[PDB]
Amino acid sequence: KAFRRYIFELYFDPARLLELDDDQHLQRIERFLDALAPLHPVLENWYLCGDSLRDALSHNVTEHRQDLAKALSRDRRTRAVELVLWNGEEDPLKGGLSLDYEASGRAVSSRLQLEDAGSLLQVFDAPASSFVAIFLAVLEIWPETTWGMLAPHAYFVHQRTFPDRRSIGWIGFCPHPLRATDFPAATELVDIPGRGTLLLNGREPMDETRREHFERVGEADIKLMELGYLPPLRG
């Protein structure tokens, strides 16, 4: 099939994300996978990763939540944690997707990412409705969310509007409230109370080859930086 690579990372406050111990850390991931399951059957079961496919199918953590603690590795000196799970589906075309959650002391490595987000495009019926659902999830369980974005791989890596800092992508979350007319026409604002708003750039999935979808996110990030909202790439 002819799918496209997509990025789905959300950055959290590195200062107070470390304050969570290994107990409350596991509970938020647990509440996130519980949120992921009703979106598609492929998101129902999650496993530990492994050096081999045979190894990575040995620990179903949805069936046995007692082994979720085995995913989280913690350094005692720096107090950084990381946790990696995966779909149990081997083929990215059929929805195969891993979950990468790391809470290091640095803002560049305090993130949650779904790799690769293009697998969810090959399986979601309405991608916009399902993609925002796991957004509003993340932000309910993690109040420390500083930034979020969903965009294709070729666009951010090579055609990002401003290379020195991040982007809003197709759907991103900025931790402040926004005015509607400060943005292009068909960019939808859903103001969540307390932590900011979420910006959607057209309910159809972005195409880096369409000049329209190019300018929407372009003219966006120009605004997003005009108000001082676009955070730097390195922290």
Binding site: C49, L97, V108
Partner: protein, 169 residues
Amino acid sequence: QGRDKDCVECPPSRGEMAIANNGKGHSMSDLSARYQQWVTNFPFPHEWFWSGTWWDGFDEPRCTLLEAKANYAFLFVPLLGVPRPWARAKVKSDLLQKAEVHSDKARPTPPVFVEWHFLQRIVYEYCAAEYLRMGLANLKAFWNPMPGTDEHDDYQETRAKEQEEMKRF
């Protein structure tokens, strides 16, 4: 800003060679070891220890720290350019966050740089784009295949047939 009376060019020159012993793989003949020795010119199983981290090599005249990665394509799906979802943890530790640590410790820049040489093109294209996403400015990735591999036969195919496409155009 300022930069004067420079006492120590290349701080990583104060490192040392040592046996790795990272619970890796032994034997001098594996593709992992032979590729590492060709990129770094370090005798197996010696590596470079500086600033508390391990580096595969160190080009002192260029003040560039080297790291070589051989067999990793089996954790990616070839045609799609993405890793296999079950190998995310191994890709994260061995390829991504190890390069993030290399970038953080290779300072000041200039003169301290770091390069990652990949035997396989498929592994190079994924990682190099990941480093650009993380903004590792002092880290450069290369597809540097070794003579004798089948990856080298594919490399000289396109670098000898790019001079047939970048000439008639």
